[PDB]
Structure 1
Amino acid sequence: TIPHLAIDPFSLDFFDDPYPDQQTLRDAGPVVYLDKWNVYGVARYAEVHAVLNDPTTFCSSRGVGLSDFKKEKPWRPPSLILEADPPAHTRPRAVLSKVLSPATMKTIRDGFAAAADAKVDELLQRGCIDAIADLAEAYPLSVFPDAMGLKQEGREHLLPYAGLVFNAFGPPNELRQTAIERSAPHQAYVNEQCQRPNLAPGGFGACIHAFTDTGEITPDEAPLLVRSLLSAGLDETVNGIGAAVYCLARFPGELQRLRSDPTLARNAFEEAVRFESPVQTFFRTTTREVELGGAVIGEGEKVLMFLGSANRDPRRWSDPDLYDITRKTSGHVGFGSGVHMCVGQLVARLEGEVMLSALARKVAAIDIDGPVKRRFNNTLRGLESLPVKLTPA
């Protein structure tokens, strides 16, 4: 009653062009079985949204990667928020929600917008730039580590640790195993910076340690919570920003609309998060036998959610393969949905908005002038290189 498919969603062939295989997954049925890794798969919007919003049946405490924590040991101590279920998840989630609150955004918006304007001006002086290394990567590195309160030394570990974390959500393929092989230096840097003395006052990390006085987290819980903000946030925002630039270059009509109304910058980034979905997939584990879309799934089974596919499901979106900066994007699952829906989504939207705004006001044309190269990751979708010409407005 369940179609069995041989598609490997963690193969380089799939990473190169996942959209045809995603339709095959959506059109085979609401629930598929992937014989390659012995997991259930859901690629339609309705089933992805259903799973994300039933955390009791589809839990996260047994890991949101392929590995089942009841069967194998986690490659690192489990995150206190991503890899936790209610009620254990609730109080750590509330701390990160207050640390990255709408009120917190007010204290950092002017500095984030200034660095974005300054980077665009710098790149306009060069003309031909790599929109990944020089823009998508450079800008978040120039605002987020300082907003965390991280010292200057050792910041070169942040990007490799981010790519390791998301590679480790995948199956034990070469991408995952080679990432873990090289992980020891990045783990040691990240864990050390999580200690309260190493986090500058006023920053995100120091604000997490300050919540230990309230009874929501204990002092021994703070370093792991800080670790969450050194694991998530970086590569997703880089990939999302890089995808928005790529879209603005592939769809010149949308850049012209953004230039004419720079207040569309926020929705232009949100639509890029839907169009690209920097986080393509992750897992849940069933805690009981469950019927999902006419399919009986046993207890203790891994369920693979295709976020990017759900964001392009024609059963939910009109013209999903088109980048439309005025699209009603509310309801996309690029940030997830339910109790685990990205706690840093306000930081990501701010970073994306102020960068697209700086582009909207200072740039007249964005033209690809070189070979585009993909960056391969078991969980993340994004570009390795995007050579573009920036024409000043």
Structure 2
Amino acid sequence: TIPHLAIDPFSLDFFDDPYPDQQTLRDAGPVVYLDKWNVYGVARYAEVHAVLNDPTTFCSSRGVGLSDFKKEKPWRPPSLILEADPPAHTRPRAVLSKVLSPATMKTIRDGFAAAADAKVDELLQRGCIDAIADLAEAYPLSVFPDAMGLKQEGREHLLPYAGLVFNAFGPPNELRQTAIERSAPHQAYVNEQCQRPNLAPGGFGACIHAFTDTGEITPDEAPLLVRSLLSAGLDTTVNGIGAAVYCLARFPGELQRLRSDPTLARNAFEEAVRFESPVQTFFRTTTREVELGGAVIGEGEKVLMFLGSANRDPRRWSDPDLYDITRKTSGHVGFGSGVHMCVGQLVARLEGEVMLSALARKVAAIDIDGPVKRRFNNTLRGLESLPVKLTPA
């Protein structure tokens, strides 16, 4: 009853151009079986949304990668939020929600905006830049480690560690194995900075530790929640901003609409998150036998959700393959949906908004003017190098 497919959604050929295979995955049926990895997959919007919003059956505490924590040791101690179910999930989630709250955004907005403006002006002086190293990576590196309250020393480990985290959600392919092998120095660096003495007062890290006073988290929980921010909080924004710039480079008409109304910056970023879906995939594990898409899935089965596919499903989206900065983007699943929906979404959107605002006000044209290279990661979609010429407004 369930179609079996041989598509490897973690192969380099798939990362290189996922969209035809994602259609094949959607059109095969509401639920497929991926023989390459012995997992179920859901690629249409409806089922992906349903699974995300059914946490008691499609759980996270057995891992949101391919590995089942009931069967194998996690490569690092489980995340107290990503890899937890309610009720255990709830108070750590509440702490990060408060640390990354609307109120907190007021404290960092001016500096985040100023750094974005300054960066775009700097790049305009250079003219021909790499929109990944010089913009998508450089801008988040210039604000987020500081906002965390990290010391200067060791920050070169941040992106490698994130690359590892996101590769490690994948199957045990070469990408994952190469990432985990000799990763100890990255792990040691991150784990050390999660300890309270190493985090600057006023920053997100210190604020997490401050919540141990309230009874919401214990002191021994705080370093793991700092670890969550150091795992998710940088590389995501790199690929989100890179996605947006790549979109604006490919859709000059939309750059021009953005220029004409910079207040479209926030939605132009949201649309980029839908369109590229920097976080492509997550898994759940069934806690019980369950019928999904007329398919009966046993207990303890891994279910692969194709977030990017869901965000391009023509059943849900008009012209899914068009980048439209005035699209009603609400309901996209690029930040997830339900109890685990991205708790750092205000930080992500703030960064994206203020960079796209700076571009909107300062740049007339973005032209790809060198070889484009894709960055391969089991979970993250994005580019390694994006040479562009920036024309000033």
Question: What TM-score results when the alignment is normalised by the length of structure 1?
Answer: 1.00
Report the RMSD for the aligned CA atoms in angstroms: 0.4
Task: For residue 235 of structure 1, report the CA deviation from its aligned partner.
Answer: 1.2
Provide the rounded CA distance (Å) in 2 between the counterparts of 1:85 and 1:22.
Answer: 29
Provide the rounded CA distance (Å) in 2 between the counterparts of 1:383 and 1:233.
Answer: 18
* CA offsets 1:366-388 (integer angstroms, 9 cap, x no match): 00001100000000000000000
Residue-pair matches, total = 393
Task: For residue 188 of structure 1, report the CA deviation from its aligned partner.
Answer: 0.2
Provide the rounded CA distance (Å) in 2 between the counterparts of 1:235 and 1:156.
Answer: 13
**Counterpart for residue 308 of structure 1:** 308
Matched ranges for 1:148-297 at <5 A: 148-297=148-297
Structure 2, unmatched stretches of 5+, are none
* CA offsets 1:210-248 (integer angstroms, 9 cap, x no match): 000101000011000100000002111111111111111
Provide the rounded CA distance (Å) in 1 between the counterparts of 2:236 and 2:319.
Answer: 24
Provide the rounded CA distance (Å) in 2 between the counterparts of 1:319 and 1:235.
Answer: 28
**Counterpart for residue 108 of structure 1:** 108
330-339 or 178-187, larger mean C-alpha shift: 178-187
Task: For residue 182 of structure 1, report the CA deviation from its aligned partner.
Answer: 2.8
* CA offsets 1:313-345 (integer angstroms, 9 cap, x no match): 000000000000000000000000000000000
Provide the rounded CA distance (Å) in 1 between the counterparts of 2:312 and 2:271.
Answer: 11
* CA offsets 1:61-115 (integer angstroms, 9 cap, x no match): 0000000000000000000000000000000000000000000000000000000
SS of aligned partner of 2:77: coil
Structure 1, unmatched stretches of 5+, are none
Provide the rounded CA distance (Å) in 2 between the counterparts of 1:66 and 1:234.
Answer: 23
Provide the rounded CA distance (Å) in 2 between the counterparts of 1:293 and 1:55.
Answer: 17
SS of aligned partner of 1:219: coil
Task: For residue 303 of structure 1, report the CA deviation from its aligned partner.
Answer: 0.1
Provide the rounded CA distance (Å) in 1 between the counterparts of 2:151 and 2:103.
Answer: 24
Task: For residue 293 of structure 1, report the CA deviation from its aligned partner.
Answer: 1.3
* CA offsets 1:268-288 (integer angstroms, 9 cap, x no match): 000000000000001000000
SS of aligned partner of 1:23: helix
Provide the rounded CA distance (Å) in 1 between the counterparts of 2:315 and 2:190.
Answer: 42
SS of aligned partner of 2:366: strand
Provide the rounded CA distance (Å) in 2 between the counterparts of 1:170 and 1:31.
Answer: 20
SS of aligned partner of 2:13: helix
Task: For residue 168 of structure 1, report the CA deviation from its aligned partner.
Answer: 0.2
Provide the rounded CA distance (Å) in 2 between the counterparts of 1:280 and 1:219.
Answer: 33
Provide the rounded CA distance (Å) in 1 between the counterparts of 2:359 and 2:143.
Answer: 17
The alignment-based identity, stated in percent, is 100
* CA offsets 1:103-132 (integer angstroms, 9 cap, x no match): 000000000000000000000000000000
Provide the rounded CA distance (Å) in 1 between the counterparts of 2:234 and 2:104.
Answer: 18
* CA offsets 1:191-225 (integer angstroms, 9 cap, x no match): 00000000000000000000001010000110001
Provide the rounded CA distance (Å) in 1 between the counterparts of 2:143 and 2:235.
Answer: 14
Provide the rounded CA distance (Å) in 2 between the counterparts of 1:233 and 1:17.
Answer: 26
Provide the rounded CA distance (Å) in 2 between the counterparts of 1:55 and 1:247.
Answer: 33
Provide the rounded CA distance (Å) in 2 between the counterparts of 1:144 and 1:181.
Answer: 27
* CA offsets 1:129-186 (integer angstroms, 9 cap, x no match): 0000000000000000000000011000000000000000000000000000131110
SS of aligned partner of 2:220: helix
* CA offsets 1:29-73 (integer angstroms, 9 cap, x no match): 000000000000000000000000000000000000000000000
Provide the rounded CA distance (Å) in 1 between the counterparts of 2:293 and 2:36.
Answer: 22
226-235 or 344-353, larger mean C-alpha shift: 226-235
Question: What TM-score results when the alignment is normalised by the length of structure 2?
Answer: 1.00
Provide the rounded CA distance (Å) in 2 between the counterparts of 1:118 and 1:268.
Answer: 20
**Counterpart for residue 317 of structure 2:** 317
Any runs of at least 4 consecutive aligned residues in structure 1 with deviations exceeding 2 A, and if so which? none
SS of aligned partner of 2:172: coil
SS of aligned partner of 2:171: coil
* CA offsets 1:290-314 (integer angstroms, 9 cap, x no match): 0111110000000000000000000
